[PDB]
Design a protein around this motif. Structure first.
Motif, PDB file in Angstrom:
ATOM      1  N   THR A 120       0.829  -1.180   0.000  1.00  0.00           N
ATOM      2  CA  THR A 120       0.000   0.000   0.000  1.00  0.00           C
ATOM      3  C   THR A 120       0.871   1.239   0.000  1.00  0.00           C
ATOM      4  OG1 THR A 120      -1.737  -1.192   1.202  1.00  0.00           O
ATOM      5  CG2 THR A 120      -1.771   1.219   1.280  1.00  0.00           C
ATOM      6  N   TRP A 121       1.834   1.276   0.915  1.00  0.00           N
ATOM      7  CA  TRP A 121       2.736   2.425   1.040  1.00  0.00           C
ATOM      8  C   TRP A 121       3.543   2.631  -0.227  1.00  0.00           C
ATOM      9  CZ3 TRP A 121       8.039   2.467   0.798  1.00  0.00           C
ATOM     10  CH2 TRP A 121       8.641   3.733   0.999  1.00  0.00           C
ATOM     11  N   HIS A 151       1.585   4.346  -3.051  1.00  0.00           N
ATOM     12  CA  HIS A 151       1.456   5.806  -2.867  1.00  0.00           C
ATOM     13  C   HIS A 151       2.776   6.540  -3.005  1.00  0.00           C
ATOM     14  CE1 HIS A 151      -2.116   4.349  -0.424  1.00  0.00           C
ATOM     15  NE2 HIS A 151      -2.580   4.811  -1.573  1.00  0.00           N
ATOM     16  N   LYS A 159       3.507   9.793  -5.085  1.00  0.00           N
ATOM     17  CA  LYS A 159       3.682  11.063  -4.375  1.00  0.00           C
ATOM     18  C   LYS A 159       5.083  11.631  -4.463  1.00  0.00           C
ATOM     19  CE  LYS A 159       0.060  10.660  -0.873  1.00  0.00           C
ATOM     20  NZ  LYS A 159      -0.539   9.288  -0.863  1.00  0.00           N
TER      21      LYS A 159
END
Lengths: 649, 649
Positions: free
Chosen positions: A99-100, A103, A107
């Protein structure tokens, strides 16, 4: 307490009877455990299978993967070890690292909150690190943590340090799992190899006699064993070896009244000489049987005895246990029937007056033959006896002797067929003989190799004493070749009834599946020596098939099977895999006309790239080809029934 | 003890989560209970369903029938009574009478064992007679026994006397059942009519204000209730009625920064003025709300409140219960997201630090609105909160107040959507808006009216504030007419969001499903009086649809639905039944071109002979037709969206 856990794990498969009966495997067999796994929100989940042995000891780390996009259906392959009762659970969990990373990759290039995102990553990697036993692995993760946190370095550099191959490897083996949730365990019964894999040969010992004593004995019949062993078989299935009734005995060709010398049908069990725990006097003594079973074992042959729970009118049970039969108002017992077939020579058992006595005696009989080395019972027409009766008997026998294999001869509707397997029958007879076209074979084997494989192990007999299919009747020898290749390559258990090798294909009449001059009703001597010398036996092909099976693990399993397309409706193609062994088969299902076709291999389904061209060897001829995506074949009936190829290493 | 009983009764359906969660119905709703029933041997089985109420009291004799030949799958229709938790069992049994009759009809004409067969029949009928409570019925059976036994009479005569219509009737009602075997009971949750059936209308009270006070209040908003009641609706669904955050408030058309007068989005719940247990000060007081709910109830309107478990940054919970939120390392809370959509104005709840506090407060909030007459909650995006959380909350609320209906707005993947219904949500939002072609509508409704109907009750909103489908954007008014007809006739629950009637169909931009100038972000006054006088509202059609629904029980159920073929891909036809009410619907899914087609009715599926021609009335026009096997229709968009016909009795 709620029914769903923190991370939903639902509908774990395989499942049999909602968990009330175990799923099946054998030792060394691999199968897929699956479940529906997901979570709330948009973060990633992970899942894994936990296989526990009879001692409750967990298996290796077995991560699952979503099996198709958007489906939330996850699966992993597991492998059964030693025999016994196992269980399996699916663990589901938040996967915060995946998940991290998702992103972070977005980002950090966009320059959004880079310090915050990078610190968030560092703390996940620290938690993941704290669980890692390896010291090198721990240092590998902490090293990435430090780099994630090095605020003097470019953002995309710090990020890259957390995405390296060796960091990936550590995390794949020891993932950081959030909110671990477990399904309730499901049962797995693991049985011996033979329950799934083996070659079966059926013959009537009485048919193997001498010019002086035409009725064969166990001592004369034992001379056939070396030939059967030499054809690569592992099991000999004998029709009933007990005395045979005289009352309403059938004569030759299923005629009503037997004449003076007629030997009758072995299934009409029982006379004053003995019942199900006795030997037919003409076959010899229990000592002669021990000799037969011993001589079999030395050739690597297991004996499978026929168990037919039914009686001739002359069976001792008829007077000793009358309440084991249904009597009409005049006292008579209606003979057994499978309409339009009548079995005038045979009384069926009634189970509702003394179920306990019947069960007790049945398990006594079985244990008697077990104490003489019979570890496999072929159960005759089990679907005319109660389902729960078989469940109880099987559970009772396997309770003390879990190696005992039961084979269910249930040519009936699918519900009964399914249920019989589900309540404990290790093996099942199938619709095989009535699947002859490409569509029939493809549909049926898709079914048998799919969800049914969690409860049913098929035994593909290409013929039986009661089944000579029209395909063979009209096909001749090339038809016998085709069916042998199919049986032997499509199921890990296959079989033939003696005479198949000589291509015996004369029916009782047109439109019948009975043999003419059936061995059920007469001694049927065969000139085995002459057939061999004249090459009028497909014994070598059979032998070659069993050798190929013994040398190719892919053929000793059921569940991994794929059908590859061809431009000819007569020509069928399929492949089976096990570890690095891959067998590829192309069959001309037309026994009368040569068929040329283009076989279009699903290359990825073999584990190959589309453009790849990998060599094969046809194990029937030893000839080599280079095959790939699209391949010409030319199969002449009589010369080549099929190509049975291995992909070369 | 065995897992299978004397007479196999297996795989009873409906089943949800293997029996761990109940199957659903509502009062007066009929559904099929099914099982796989069979026995050993060749004799007949019978089966029946036993429905037991919350007191455990059995229902009426409910005999099952095999649903397809050779399948061993049996089914019967059952009907739910009063609300509560019920259970259902299937009883399976040997049917020796049907068996005997079969043989007797064959043997007696053939002259086989006629006295024995006839005596056998006589003894079954004697046993059958001994169970019969009726005296006239008992005498009717004994009369047949005597006849069966009258050895002075012709065999086929004696037989005929046991096969009479009145003997059949006695036996059909009180059959002789051998070896009765029961499944383990399965759970049935029976809920109130409104959980399945009802017409829903959504509006924003704030949009109904005055020239002096544009922001509407509950007292001004209540003036809309009579018009909504007059359109035939039963439920009014209000978006969040609480105070709205100021921090990161959205402005008009979902712009980032709101200016002076901007009212924000109701879903951004919470300010210093109050949270989820408060009223927005501009809407008035809790007393004004009680007035709105009272005035609604008098018009036959129930209120459904939005429940959105999420917070603006200004919600008291943010400082009072910080552990109900996930904070990043800098202390900030990431705003909620449904990517690519960002909800900068809204903080999501975190459930893993204080699940018990969250659960306790949630049920407190719900009970507060319940104490004010709210008995229906429309639960906003439930799929971003834990599944088990909803299970616990729903079970807690229905534990004391089983009338409370929860509607799940879960526009997500099927696993989550299904699971949400299965863990207790009375109703579900669906994929309806994205099913617009005949194949889409047919596939989806086949699915919804099939096995899913045991756990999901669909609510077909033709539009929502967040969904203006392209079909409507490009279709105009005739598309609004089509979708209204479909929603209202395909599901027993349907709904519209205010503005649908005026055919508001301007999107934020091409390829968006957002409305332009969305009411989510602004007051949106409508000249309802002008629209009515100028005929620019489809309010009369809507009113007619709800009237048709209220007058036709077939339209107040889900599961009975059949699709009848047509020769036009633009033209869809289907029928629904309940008792003797049959509604037949034909729709032109093309909103721009007239379509003529031949509708080919499955006559037996309506309960009619193929040659029959039974009359209909189109309830939209009052015009009468005589329809049968093949029917011409001609549907002009703007003039006629559809034919909504009742079959005349």
């Amino acid at each position: 307490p709620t029914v769903v856990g923190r991370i939903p794990v639902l509908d774990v498969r395989p499942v049999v009877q909602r968990g009330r009966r175990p799923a099946k495997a054998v030792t060394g067999e691999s199968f897929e455990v699956s479940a529906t796994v997901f979570r709330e929100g948009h973060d990633a989940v992970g899942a894994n299978v936990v296989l526990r042995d009879p001692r409750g000891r967990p298996g290796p780390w077995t991560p699952m993967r979503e099996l198709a996009p958007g489906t939330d259906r996850w699966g992993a392959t597991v492998t059964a070890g030693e025999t016994g009762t196992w269980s399996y659970t699916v663990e589901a969990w938040g996967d915060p690292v995946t998940t991290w990373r998702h992103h972070a990759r977005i980002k950090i290039p966009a320059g959004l909150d880079t310090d915050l995102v990078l610190e968030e990553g560092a703390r996940l990697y620290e938690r993941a690190a704290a669980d890692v036993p390896g010291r090198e692995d721990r240092r590998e993760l902490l090293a990435a943590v430090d780099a994630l946190r090095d605020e003097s370095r470019p953002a995309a550099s710090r990020l890259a340090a957390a995405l390296t191959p060796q960091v990936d490897a550590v995390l794949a083996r020891h993932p950081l799992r959030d909110l671990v949730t477990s399904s309730d365990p499901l049962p797995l019964l693991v049985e011996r190899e033979r329950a799934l894999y083996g070659a079966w040969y059926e013959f009537f010992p009485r048919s193997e006699g001498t010019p002086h004593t035409p009725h064969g004995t166990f001592r004369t019949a034992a001379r056939r064993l070396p030939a059967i062993a030499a054809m690569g078989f592992d099991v000999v299935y004998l029709p009933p070896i007990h005395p045979i009734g005289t009352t309403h005995r059938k004569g030759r060709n299923n005629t009503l009244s037997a004449t003076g010398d007629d030997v009758g049908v072995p299934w009409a069990i029982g006379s004053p000489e003995g019942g199900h725990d006795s030997i037919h006097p003409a076959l010899g003594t229990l000592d002669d049987f021990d000799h037969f079973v011993t001589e079999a074992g030395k050739l690597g042959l297991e004996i499978a005895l026929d168990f037919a729970l039914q009686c001739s009118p002359d069976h001792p049970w008829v007077h000793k246990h009358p309440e084991w039969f249904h009597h009409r108002p005049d006292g008579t017992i209606a003979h057994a029937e499978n309409p339009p077939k009548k079995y005038q020579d045979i009384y069926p058992i009634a189970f509702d007056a003394d179920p306990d006595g019947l069960a007790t005696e049945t398990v006594r009989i079985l244990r008697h033959w077990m104490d003489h080395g019979v570890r496999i019972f072929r159960v005759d027409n089990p679907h005319t006896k109660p389902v729960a009766f078989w469940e109880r008997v099987i559970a009772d026998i396997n309770g003390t002797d879990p190696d005992v294999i039961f084979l269910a001869e249930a040519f009936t509707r699918p519900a009964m067929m399914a249920t019989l397997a589900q309540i404990g029958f290790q093996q099942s007879y199938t619709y095989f003989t009535w699947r002859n076209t490409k569509q029939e074979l493809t549909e049926y084997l898709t079914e048998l190799s799919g969800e049914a494989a969690s409860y049913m192990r098929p035994n593909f007999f290409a013929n039986t004493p009661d089944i000579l299919h029209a395909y063979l009747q009209h096909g001749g020898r090339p038809a016998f070749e085709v069916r042998a290749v199919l049986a032997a390559t499509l199921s890990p258990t296959w079989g033939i009834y003696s005479g198949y090798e000589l291509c015996e294909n004369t029916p009782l009449r047109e439109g019948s599946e009975e043999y003419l001059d059936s061995e059920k009703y007469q001694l049927k001597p065969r000139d085995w020596t002459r057939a061999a010398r004249e090459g009028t036996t497909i014994a070598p092909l059979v032998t070659r098939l069993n050798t190929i099976r013994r040398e190719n693990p892919a053929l000793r399993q059921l569940r991994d099977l794929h059908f590859h397309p061809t431009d000819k409706e007569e020509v069928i193609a399929y492949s089976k895999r096990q570890g690095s062994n891959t067998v590829l088969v192309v069959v001309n299902l037309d026994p009368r006309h040569t068929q040329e076709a283009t076989v279009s291999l699903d290359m990825p389904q073999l584990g190959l790239d589309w453009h790849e061209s990998v060599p094969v060897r046809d194990e029937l001829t030893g000839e080599t080809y280079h095959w790939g995506r699209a391949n010409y074949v030319r199969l002449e009936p009589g010369r080549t029934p099929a190509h049975v190829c291995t992909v070369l290493r």
